[PDB]
């Protein structure tokens, strides 16, 4: 139904910026809830922020742990979503994948990886000290 694809990761020094972006497939973009998670080697995957379906307004919700860094934002013209990543810190290296829902605009338990029903790839990004 849904196809997800990250770009945008690499390599980059602390106090930088990356923004990664997921291009998406599936006819009803704008009805779906969208996320970013991230997997540091070794460690479980994280919720990192999530952003509303349109007809919910498109809200945006964040872990706390990130102290306002990071922006999620949808472009439902081009079927795309984007994380900027602002002031970048070593332990911010990981894998990040989007992930979408086509069944919730909106969820309780947002920050939960068992409720989206579709995943992409992964990008890698290392934060060097
Ligand atoms: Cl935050
Ligand atoms: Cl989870």
């Known amino acids: 139904q849904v196809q997800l694809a990250e770009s945008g990761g690499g390599l980059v020094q602390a106090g930088g910026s990356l923004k990664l972006s997921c291009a998406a497939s599936g006819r009803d973009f704008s009805m779906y809830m969208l996320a970013w998670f991230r997997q540091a080697p070794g460690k479980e995957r994280e919720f990192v922020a999530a952003i509303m379906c349109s007809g919910g307004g498109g809200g945006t919700y964040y872990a706390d742990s990130m102290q306002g860094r990071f922006t999620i934002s949808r472009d439902n013209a081009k079927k795309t979503v984007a994380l900027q990543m602002n002031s970048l810190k070593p332990e911010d290296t990981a894998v990040y994948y989007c992930?979408?829902?086509?069944?919730?605009?909106?969820?309780?338990?947002?920050?939960?990886?068992?409720?989206?029903?579709?995943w992409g790839q992964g990008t890698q990004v290392t934060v060097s000290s």
């Open positions: 992930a979408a829902s086509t069944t919730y605009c909106s969820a309780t338990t947002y920050s939960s990886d068992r409720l989206y029903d579709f």
